[PDB]
């Protein structure tokens, strides 16, 4: 795991049949005309999750200090390293929105906090699956903060007792809670346009 | 192995199941409206590596002396000779980044240095596979810098 706040990226979790892994979502915001490129061998549901997170952020510009018109002035590129492994499912919506909001607002994001959950178009956090493998993988790599949907607190019983002593889980229902908790409050970079 | 530094050309390495070979990546920056052609019958991961390198170069344009508006003034064409041979994988990212930056900044790239490695949007170089075959192929073609 990283240890430095990085503007434009966020730490996420994934589920494989051999255990959990770590996703890292990278977003760049460059001057352009309004486009959305999605690289990293992404599946279709994960592309739709990215589009849902972006449409949520286009409706709440003044809430987060975003630029007023980035829908036709800024090109966005979302890349999920590495490039050779295929990826899917809807569990990465909150990581998408954190990465895109940090990239547009030019304020860094904390990298010591893993997160997971599905986002909707109103900003609601919906529950996900495969949670205990993801929490094991987050614990074995030295991450001690988890952001999790509130409808998954019935899923924490399957963990070993020694695992959930070290973690501290924050339960959420709204994306604004997540963006208040992850982003550092003042910008470090000049604006895009 | 070529001897003279060229504009818009970088020396790469490739892995085949009968040994390693050399890749050469050629790029050209002509006046246009901003688009990206990718010929050489490249795979999909290859093309995604190309546009990831281009996004990194568009983000950091004061560092390398690139023109400030090449995203809507310059067409880029990335060719990997030869044709009638298929090519893939993510290991040619630092090669495409060097080639495209040499084509846009009009600075020649050294051709006596071979490269391999994967690139991301933050500009991090990531590890690869097949190092032994690639470095044995670079040694018998006369390249002594990796």
């Amino acid at each position: 795991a990283e240890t430095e706040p990085q503007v434009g990226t966020a730490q996420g979790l994934a589920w494989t049949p051999v255990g959990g892994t770590l996703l890292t979502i990278e977003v760049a915001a460059v001057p352009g005309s309004g486009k959305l490129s999605l690289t990293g061998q992404l599946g279709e549901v994960m592309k739709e999750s990215a589009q849902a997170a972006l449409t949520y952020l286009r409706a709440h510009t003044q809430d987060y200090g975003l630029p007023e018109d980035f829908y036709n002035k800024v090109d966005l590129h979302v890349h999920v390293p590495d490039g050779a492994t295929p990826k899917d499912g809807p569990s990465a919506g909150i990581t998408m929105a954190t990465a895109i909001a940090s990239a547009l607002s030019r304020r860094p994001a904390r990298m010591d906090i893993a997160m997971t959950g599905e986002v909707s178009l109103r900003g609601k956090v919906m529950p996900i699956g495969g949670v205990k493998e993801k929490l094991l993988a987050a614990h074995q790599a030295g991450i001690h903060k988890i952001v999790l949907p509130k409808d998954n607190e019935a899923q924490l019983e399957e963990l070993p007792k020694e695992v959930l002593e070290g973690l501290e889980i924050k339960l959420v229902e709204d994306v604004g809670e997540v963006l208040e908790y992850l982003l550092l409050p003042e910008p470090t970079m000049p604006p895009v346009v | 192995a070529e001897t003279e530094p060229q504009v818009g050309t970088a020396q790469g390495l490739a892995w085949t199941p009968v040994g390693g070979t050399l890749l050469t990546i050629e790029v050209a920056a002509v006046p246009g409206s901003g688009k990206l052609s990718l010929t050489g019958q490249l795979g999909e991961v290859m093309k995604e590596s190309a546009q990831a390198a281009l996004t990194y170069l568009r983000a950091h344009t004061q560092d390398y002396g690139l023109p400030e508006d090449f995203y809507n003034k310059v067409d880029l064409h990335v060719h990997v000779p030869d044709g009638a041979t298929p090519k893939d994988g993510p290991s040619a990212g630092i090669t495409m980044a060097t080639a495209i930056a040499s084509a846009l900044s009009r600075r020649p790239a050294r051709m006596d240095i071979a490269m391999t490695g994967e690139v991301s949007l933050r500009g991090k170089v990531m590890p690869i596979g097949g190092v032994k075959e690639k470095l044995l192929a670079a040694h018998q073609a006369g390249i002594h810098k990796i």
Partner: protein, 146 residues
């Protein structure tokens, strides 16, 4: 489990089964003789108590030779196995006190009637410190001894 019940132990393995004629054998008309793989397991054990492990139910199929899942429904249901017969033995055999234990890796390839006769126990992998504890207590002294 076989230790804590003073039983004996045996293992079977169903991954290979492609046909129905491997579970129940063949009659005496043919010159060779090969009975089914159940009583053939119970020849090796002395009593009619012991536990029988059934490994990889979720890995079996059929091709123009009968469904093995019907024979598994016959051997596992406790009121059809009391009159369970063979093609080689041609008499009903008593299966009333053996304790069948079944073993699989995947759920969606288990046949639909066999899912109703089962309650599922999921075993959720391991972590690193408990794999370290298993390697300290059990595996490394064995590999040192042999």
């Amino acid at each position: 489990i076989a230790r804590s019940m003073n039983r004996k132990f045996h293992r079977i393995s169903l991954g290979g089964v492609r046909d129905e004629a491997e579970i129940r054998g063949h009659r005496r008309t043919y010159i060779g003789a090969m009975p089914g793989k159940l009583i053939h397991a119970m020849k090796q054990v002395g009593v009619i108590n012991p536990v029988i492990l059934l490994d990889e139910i979720d890995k079996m199929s059929s091709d123009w030779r009968g469904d093995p899942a019907s024979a598994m429904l016959e051997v596992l249901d406790p009121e059809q196995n009391n009159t369970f017969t063979d093609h080689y033995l041609d008499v009903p055999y008593d299966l009333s006190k053996v304790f069948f234990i079944t073993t699989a890796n995947t759920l969606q390839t288990i046949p639909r009637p066999l899912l109703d006769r089962m309650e599922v126990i999921e075993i959720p992998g391991y972590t690193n410190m408990e794999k370290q504890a298993i390697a300290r207590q059990y595996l490394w002294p064995k590999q040192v001894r042999e």
